[PDB]
Design a protein around this ligand. Structure first.
Ligand SMILES: O=C1N=C2NC(=O)NC(=O)[C@]2(OO)N1
Ligand SMILES: O=C1N=C2NC(=O)NC(=O)[C@]2(OO)N1
Ligand SMILES: O=C1N=C2NC(=O)NC(=O)[C@]2(OO)N1
Ligand SMILES: O=C1N=C2NC(=O)NC(=O)[C@]2(OO)N1
Lengths: 295, 295, 295, 295
């Protein structure tokens, strides 16, 4: 037997950082959960009880905190690139570092209509994430995403013209609820190293903002023929607005809201044009995926 | 043996309702999770296999949806009062109805700076809740709350002067992080029935808004001596602003963010005035409670 | 305004303890999550920023670990009584200690049919809990429970003869699935102090074992007329087997499994006597409660 | 722009099935959660609002229940192969079906030392899973796994000889706690179709049992040099016991239990040989992975 694949490291590392402007008094906070997994010439730790090749996961944890102390933690694409680069440069025998960062929201409070200098609210469980793979001799591969963006529209969603056979019970509809939890990922052109990542730094926040804006506006405004058709429009627009993206991926649950026929009770009309009260379904759920690239 | 207490009903009933203004096209959505538990002359269902006294939980579910179809679902204090009153009026042998409602956020989207007529975002997992106890001959007892309001301030929190003995390791501090998940409850004067509840309807949304506003502003602005001292200020202000409240209760975790001494690594200074990177602690957590009333 | 109620302390304190028999080599592990909340002459911490009355929650945490080091952690009723007694004895101004313990399962592994001396499996997420309220001048009040015991029977559950009116759609049944998550609590006679608790120590494990045995056997063997009728039988049996219990409480969800009519597809018969494939319903769920005492 | 990848279907489909032996009265229950995602000539549903190519996810749900009615649901490898094969055979334009099944435990109760004919306990949240990818022209690729198997050993775990540099604070140890949640996957030789899968049916339950047995015994008996070294031994043993497996993958968190120095309190000794009370750490956690194949 032989080791065909191996990686190891520290997961679920919670990190907070504060920036304090002593001149203005304005403080800004960042909170993340970080995972770093390493690959390299580590097989003997598995096959021969050779711990000499192991950079302890505890040490990886320490390194995450040290790197956050010595560098900006934003944008997460940059921080993850710095962190991953560190491991492959510091340790000859480590040849890849896989850095996942989940960024938690701490939005500055407005109090009596003015932004507060040091108070924040978790205004959504929506996350901004990165997956930064630093692979020695193969640059830096970055996937950026937003996830946990939960939305609903109460009309201007349709679903008709789907295949009908002996397995089909679903009624066609021209007016339904659509709700989802958006998971949207944009995959960057490979970067050659940390200099090239740094050279594009403003594009990371800008592209995240674009992706979010396009997602919301397209969801709100598209009189949707299907989840498939709507999500494709989102992806093509994001690709058109950032040439350093190669692909955009969406993964969207269709979180069903079922009509409730109440006509058995005193002839109450609660379906079709009269539908007001619905049963949100926790499960099951449609799950619709696609990855869009350029032709 | 004998039945000393009993209640039963349907829990975890998800409910959506839409309102459609056909003139303007503006749609408004409401989503809840409802629990209704009944008490009454039901002991023989337990002791004698007498199901004749049981209003089936399935029927309670149906009734929740019917009541939502036939009545406003907002404010939740009103909806819960209507729903609870129904059971004690409809069924002679049912003498209490305990209605819990969790209201989920669906905040209208702004698209290109304009409110969208039918698209919504779950802008926070914060909930607005009610507990409405309709007890035959004893009116309607309502507890309103907000919960899951997660906040952090990066300075202007202190904790010194606490008891120090042989069990104490905690250092005094004059500048720390404070973060919590706010659970705040206001208990209304007993209402005699549904007419009296209806007579105060505007006060429910207004008092929720007050409670939220006071919580946020006091958290942001109080240079906090302790969680205890800050939460008391919140409660006393809410009591001063609504005379139909009898008590205000807060339950606040102290979600600790620990300094990380990095001085073992190249003399890095990350404590005290130099503290920038912290370790959020998932557990354990302080838990601080109080109920404030009028003197 | 004035403080009508207050308590505070440390929640979510994870604790592991090992016992090592150096003679035999057999090791035994215990794992808990502990919460201790204190009451007393603490109102000025809320009203006057008086921290002198606060035993820091950090110190309460330290005390939990010290007490676990210096005492048995089993049975949890005893450990909680020791821990609660400590606070009211050590601190003149503290007059109640509220101790909640959740015990996690670490069941010894059998390897090649022999119990292993130091290896364990989390064989269920079922918990054994206590709530120990030590109140100065009022002894020690203990509620013991088991929770998260998830069971299903595939027949020998019925539900017919329930009230039928204009809100009822549920069909009567003489053969259905019954599944629940058992939460069962037994409330002990008040104990005068720690000596009296200690004098009954063997009864704690014995009564937990009885409660579990009775729950399982009654669930399995009762051809159930309703959740109500079955749970009452469990409670009355437990009361008959331990005179130092005053009441037994059950809280049982009815975790519904719905038939699926497939007759629209090629006449497939999957209802009534032909029902084989069912749809487990995540929500909503019936919730059935009762507290049984002696007549 | 163009669709580079797409798949869609129904997720989170809960399924129960009962088998009833009318001769013996013994009933046996199965409960799963199923996901089926399809690929094929579906791009126009995304690009052109062409729903004609969509087999509705609702219909996929119906098909799961119909297939469970008409076929065995065990072993899950077989059920998933039947289900996946159905979609690629029934629909010309569908060319892959990706079937994930999570199997939930319903272990038969023993009551008064005898197996009960129709009562079951969720004896662990451990799962048995499959991932069955049926790809037209490319057979059936099956990955089988066990997950959520939570274990702890209180000694006979070591970790010393790891790399030490300026990022390292971790003390070497020759006696520590090791706890993990086992996720173990075995990847089968490609099968040509459903006949070949059926021809190996007994091997599925047998190999799952082997994997579980080896995991437990190796964990219990290996005086572990590291998670890496122990998990490799598990994988090599499983490969040696089933030649139709190509690889075995483990993913193991190192769920840390930290010593608590109590020497600040009355000289209490709770470290090293005197360590009895530990602090389980919820996060962060080491995460150790490897995939083992044959040389
Ligand atoms: O039943 C279905 N209903 C759906 N709606 C949709 O937009 N696309 C689908 O493919 C579908 O996803 O859930 N299938
Ligand atoms: O250690 C403590 N630190 C705290 N901070 C606080 O505001 N009050 C407390 O009572 C305390 O709550 O967590 N105890
Ligand atoms: O619809 C119902 N079905 C039930 N079954 C039951 O055992 N008791 C009830 O009161 C019931 O609880 O869920 N109500
Ligand atoms: O700090 C570490 N401690 C560990 N223990 C271990 O068995 N292997 C590691 O690589 C390690 O994983 O968590 N790193």
């Amino acid at each position: 037997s032989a080791v065909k694949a191996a990686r190891y490291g520290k997961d679920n590392v919670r990190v907070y950082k504060v920036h304090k402007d002593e001149k203005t008094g304005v403080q800004t906070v960042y909170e993340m959960t970080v995972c770093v997994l390493l690959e390299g010439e580590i097989e003997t730790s598995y096959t021969k009880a050779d711990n000499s090749v192991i950079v302890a996961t505890d040490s990886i944890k320490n390194t995450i905190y040290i790197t956050a102390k010595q560098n900006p933690v934003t944008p997460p694409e940059l921080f993850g690139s710095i962190l991953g680069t560190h491991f492959i440069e510091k340790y000859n025998h480590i040849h890849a570092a896989h850095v996942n960062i989940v960024c938690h929201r701490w939005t500055r409070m407005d109090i009596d209509g003015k932004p507060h200098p040091h108070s924040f609210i978790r205004d959504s469980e929506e996350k901004r994430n990165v997956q930064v793979d630093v692979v020695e001799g193969k640059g830096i591969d970055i996937k950026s995403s937003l996830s946990g963006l939960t939305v609903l529209k109460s009309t201007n969603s349709q679903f008709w013209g789907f295949l009908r056979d002996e397995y089909t019970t679903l009624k066609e509809t021209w007016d339904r609820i659509l709700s989802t939890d958006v998971d949207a990922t944009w995959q960057w052109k490979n970067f050659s190293g940390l200099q090239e990542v740094r050279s594009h730094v403003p594009k990371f926040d800008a592209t995240w903002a674009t992706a979010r804006e396009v997602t919301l506006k397209t969801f709100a405004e598209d009189n949707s023929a299907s989840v498939q058709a709507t999500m494709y429009k989102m992806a093509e627009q994001i690709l058109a607005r950032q040439q350093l993206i190669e692909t955009v991926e969406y993964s969207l649950p269709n979180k069903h809201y079922f009509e409730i026929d109440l006509s058995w009770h005193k002839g109450l009309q609660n379906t079709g044009k009269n539908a007001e009260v619905f049963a949100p379904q926790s499960d099951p759920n449609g799950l619709i995926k696609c990855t869009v690239g350029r032709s």
